[PDB]
Symmetry: C3
Subunit: 278 residues, 3 copies
């Protein structure tokens, strides 16, 4: 059966997504997760919620233990991870209040543990070279988008629809993120360069979360929240969180409604075939 | 009220900017600075000098303790930091002997401690996400430029001047730097890519120094010396002359800083830090 | 030994056996242990030393390879040259799986690796070294690799001097640029498109800081890249890569002989001098 883990970013430091059966603390071979995990159900589907930055948002993007977080979710029996990521827009059609179901990224992070495998004592034995050309689980991506349609939230698909048919607030059916290391925001120079490369949004937390999920044999999809006076932004972002929560809840249900036997098996075999030491 | 900190790069390993009234060997929560700090006065203005690489230039750019350097200056009561930086050019209008008052950068460093805040045992508690769109203190930049004018040095501003106004040597009124980690220089491939991105100069020491200064609530401006990394004797003499010019600019700049009131700007700097504390918001 | 050729074997060369072993050296360096034991012997009359970058069982990922120990160990055994192999993915349509590239440029996207012998840390040599890297390889040694290809009847394609219709596969490209990513994951499509738009020819994980450290050590370094396919298709690619390994072996052995056939006194002196002149602490 499926079990859906949820990694909550900003706006989700302490989310009340459902009636919790209980709070759980776990450990992993790679250290402690960001915080304790909230266990519960969405209908008949098991769900686990984990705040990326910890309840008090005391852990910056570069110091988040992504391995521990993803591995904890794996060990709890999760088959899927849905993640939220607060982001800044680099393109005119992506405005604050919009969401993006990412399908691509460019990595500018460093100093973070980005693989479970290696030759150091603090890692699993072996050399894993994972294909990442299309880094997300496509079935899971499409579920997030269908969830938005189901909650009457506008979906904008730039290859199917013309620019004039972009109606805000909307979920962009695709998009690419540049993930910077942080914690500082980009300079104007950097943003112009990132925009020139054709990137859609900038964030700090997508990588290596997405990579580690694939290493763990888990189906992963990310929904980014465009947030780009402070009180107004908070109100807009608060409004966005309501809709993101709606999307996440519907998506968990949608995942539970389908059979994932072949896809899961494919996830696991992809890990096996990427082992270069074997 | 104000106190001007100066971080000396190459050519300033043993600054000697003024008669040292006192020296301070400090220890910060983030380690020891590059060397002892030298205190004194330029006119009536309090000033503190620190060689970024240490007296013997034994410390490479990636191993400089920028946090300790910036914090030590902060702890001494500095309100401003002026920094010098030796660089190579990526564009034809910038030639050896020129200077650049930077207003932008693109960061390609790594493995340096670039923030005071975080969840590590030695971090200040909290998460700080500073805006860096215009990463320098604009008032302090304009002071460097005006200081150059005051010392009869050509100032070139491509935004408002024809290219015929670019008379060498000149201080370029704006410019973007790529900061590479070092210690090696770039390949031709890398240089071509940086040039294509529209970057003006390349250096190894600007980041995270500029970032950490802003986290500290300090006003920071950088003056880059364009030199040649490709006859050695003529280049060295040229760089020697450049060092003299920068010394003059720095001295005039300290004087110009102390002549203005910085109450509002200092308050705004401190506020920006507090407003960027995500753990608090 | 006036000249002695160090060889760093990458994927396909975990357990190389390029010549009869004469001496198996278990060495330590100031920067730690090399990826494996070093195997000394001869190719004809030329002294030669071979070392597997990833160790025998290929257990060491690109980002965890001790490039300093590997280069320094070879320097310590008296090597004057380093020839290195590396597997890579193609970013351009003219470079197909089965081709080889004698690289002349790179763009570095590695991090977290020790990339210099010098510093202020106790784990480094005293001093600050700022090496020029505009053309990061030993040009003479590059031309040896290419001439070696010719001597073994392998197609050589030079884009600068030859027409595009003369690009006959499989072939050795006489020049090329690599982006070196940190790994261990391969690139996203987004990253590959960006790298291609920058004009880069191939992507690898092992070139940097190996090339940089070899120059720091005053050694003549040249690299030959094996273009493979990272996208039963697997059975076919494996077969192609096996043939690539065989041909690169022939190139390396012929290159060693070619190096042994010339004087290197001036070039070696220049390598040593470039190190000394790059000391910013003097």
């Amino acid at each position: 059966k499926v079990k859906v883990g949820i990694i909550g970013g900003s706006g989700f430091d302490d989310p009340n997504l459902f009636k919790k059966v209980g709070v759980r603390q776990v450990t992993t071979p790679f250290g402690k997760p960001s915080d304790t995990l909230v266990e519960g159900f969405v209908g008949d589907v098991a769900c686990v919620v984990l705040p990326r930055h910890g309840k008090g948002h005391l852990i910056p993007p570069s110091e988040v233990n992504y391995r521990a977080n993803v591995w904890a979710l794996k060990d709890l029996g999760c088959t899927h991870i849905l993640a939220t990521n607060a982001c800044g827009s680099l393109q005119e059609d992506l405005v604050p209040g919009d969401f993006v179901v990412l399908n691509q990224f460019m990595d500018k992070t460093w100093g973070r543990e980005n693989t479970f495998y290696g030759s150091k004592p603090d890692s699993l034995k072996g050399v894993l070279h994972m294909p990442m050309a299309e880094p997300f689980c496509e079935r899971t991506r499409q579920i997030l988008i269908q969830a938005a349609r189901n909650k009457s939230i506008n979906v904008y698909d730039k290859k199917t629809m013309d620019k004039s048919a972009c109606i805000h607030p909307c979920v962009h059916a695709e998009g690419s993120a540049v993930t910077i290391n942080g914690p500082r925001f980009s300079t104007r120079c950097e943003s112009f360069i990132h925009k020139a490369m054709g990137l859609d949004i900038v964030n700090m937390t997508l990588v290596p979360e997405v990579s580690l999920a694939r290493e763990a044999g888990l189906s992963y999809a990310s929904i980014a929240i465009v947030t780009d006076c402070v009180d107004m932004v908070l109100e807009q972002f608060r409004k966005s969180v309501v809709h993101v929560r709606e999307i996440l809840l519907e998506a968990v249900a949608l995942i539970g409604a389908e059979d994932w036997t072949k896809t899961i098996e494919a996830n696991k075999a992809l890990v096996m075939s990427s082992r270069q030491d074997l």
